[PDB]
Amino acid sequence: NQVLTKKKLQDLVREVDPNEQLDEDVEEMLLQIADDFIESVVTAACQLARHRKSSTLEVKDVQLHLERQWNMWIPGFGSEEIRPYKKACTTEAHKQRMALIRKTTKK
Template sequence: LTVLSPQSNLNFLLISLPPPGAGMANSTATAVKVMGAPGPAGRSSPEGSQVLSKKKLQDLVREIDPNEQLDEDVEEMLLQIADDFIESVVTAACQLARHRKSNSLEVKDVQLHLERQWNMWIPGYGSDEIRPFKKACTTEAHKQRMALIRKTTKK
């Protein structure tokens, strides 16, 4: 399965799902690769295999604080965390696609995982419907206070 990513500078994501007849044990992605632009001699550069390059990370840091400089170890750790996050999101989204009995990954699979597990709402990819508002449960003490307020306002 190839998922084109027109809104980013990634060439494509290559995601391999098991066939629809396979059980849930085989429901995770068997390969998740971000293909970068070929480097010298036609090979992909090491930074091309990462979603977030060191240069992009440094640009993000400069946007927040132009005087901040990250240590090399911190950069490596942040890049690893970003790669792990992407891999876990894609794996979970593939499981959702398999649960739908589909062998194609859709945006709604990624959306559902990000919304439920990370409480992330991606602007521009959501439906036009309003997000459900979770009404807080009223406790017994609150009900008693409200009854007392109503009682005193009636007098």
């Protein structure tokens, strides 16, 4: 029950520079960073699914963790049409307190 098998990792190095080797100190660590990355993403992605009061992990909340934290957009999956972007819901209390900063400044 391992997800990466040291031949898929070796081809990941061969596609970058084919005359390059890794050490077993580096391979045993490169097999470790991916597994930790999977655990961190899944635990956060479960709480986004637990936020929506659902019990199924969809692709719409593995998207929101990688975009916001890890800066990863995985292209070939597609989403629903994004709703019209709400720009500024500035409240009345901010519209009247910030209209006092200017009232003292110029008057």
